[PDB]
Amino acid sequence: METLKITVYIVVTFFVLLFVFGFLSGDPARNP
């Protein structure tokens, strides 16, 4: 438990930083 906690914590923040950066990486630009 000690290990899976920081395993999930890194997994969560990497997907969440992927969420936050990709909407910061010009989501108004990506329109037809």
Binding site: F23, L24, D27, P28, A29, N31, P32
Partner: protein, 451 residues
Amino acid sequence: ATNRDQESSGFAWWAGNARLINLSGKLLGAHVAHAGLIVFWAGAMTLFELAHFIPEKPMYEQGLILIPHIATLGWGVGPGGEVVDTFPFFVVGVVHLISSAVLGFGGVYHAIRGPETLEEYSSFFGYDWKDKNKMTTILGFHLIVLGIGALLLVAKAMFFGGLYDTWAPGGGDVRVITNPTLDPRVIFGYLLKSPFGGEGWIVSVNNLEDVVGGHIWIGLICIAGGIWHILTTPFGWARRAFIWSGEAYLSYSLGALSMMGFIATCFVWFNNTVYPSEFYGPTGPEASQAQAMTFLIRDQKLGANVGSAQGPTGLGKYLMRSPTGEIIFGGETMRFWDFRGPWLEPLRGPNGLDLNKIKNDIQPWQERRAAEYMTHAPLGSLNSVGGVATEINSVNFVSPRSWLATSHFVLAFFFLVGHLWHAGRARAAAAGFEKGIDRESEPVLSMPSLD
């Protein structure tokens, strides 16, 4: 007569407030007349609550939501949440209601008489929605004013009377909070608190020290964020991260207000510091722990061995353990073991509730407060029958906490829907397909197949 049919605006009558997006004088009078409506309701309800007010009865027994807000500020209440002067309630009703005619004048003036756009008469007041530094200038002006408003609360708390403290000694009393928490590791340690049980993100603020010092911190970063947004233009990472439209900033505000309504719902439901149970009634947690206490009191008064008394299931009927190990109240109220009120901290030692502080140390004001809080739980009906859904029509009681949490959940959910409506639309509007798909240049017939 511009933007007043669908021939000139392209907006119908049911979206006719959207005809005012580019009409700065008319949109100002829309907002000042609506500001006049909120200050009217603040005034007229407070008068309605004080005209129908019994200072014998507690505030939660009277369907009062606004008299508890003035009473929390430390106005006209003394020891234990008891009204000694209803005139500070009446003034708040009169100063708001009379001010509503001034905002009602200025709302009616700018809407139906003034210049339709402010862009000609006053370049300081005239704004374009897609002018980014002007849109922070109004944001910087409004941030300083909310920094002024969050310092007025500190002023009332530190100088002009103090707020009502539920955790005053010997019961609740209006207390001048003279040593507020200026420590940012405590103020912003609330922000990193878990929302979930036992942590209770910012709803767990349980003393008026962190409240005042948190409003020194919020009240001065809003001033320093006002001076920030007055003196700067938006940076380039933010210009590509936002739609800069009138409906866009509306949607960002709607999404912010959905956060705030869902949080204030949680404040009035869980917090009994900034929403004292003297005025607002016991919380959902507070009444279930009061019921377990009343029968902890009643049965030990008949000589029950309440630590060793067992439930039907093997657990303690009065006193079991939390899953962390604290001696907590038995029954179903084991879900509410994270509840802190001031009528049971004289029971709580370091292992949870102290059994030796239950036997020879429960005061009669605590037996009185637990029996009151049990029979005034925030359970009630929509026609305001107190009690459970299977209760008979004798008790005309719904808590203000139930009224405030449910109304600000109805409002906060719709404001999330209104955010989803307006954020989707304002990004469809800035890209140019909110009115539909162009048939001559339909994107999907120019988009490749799937399989």
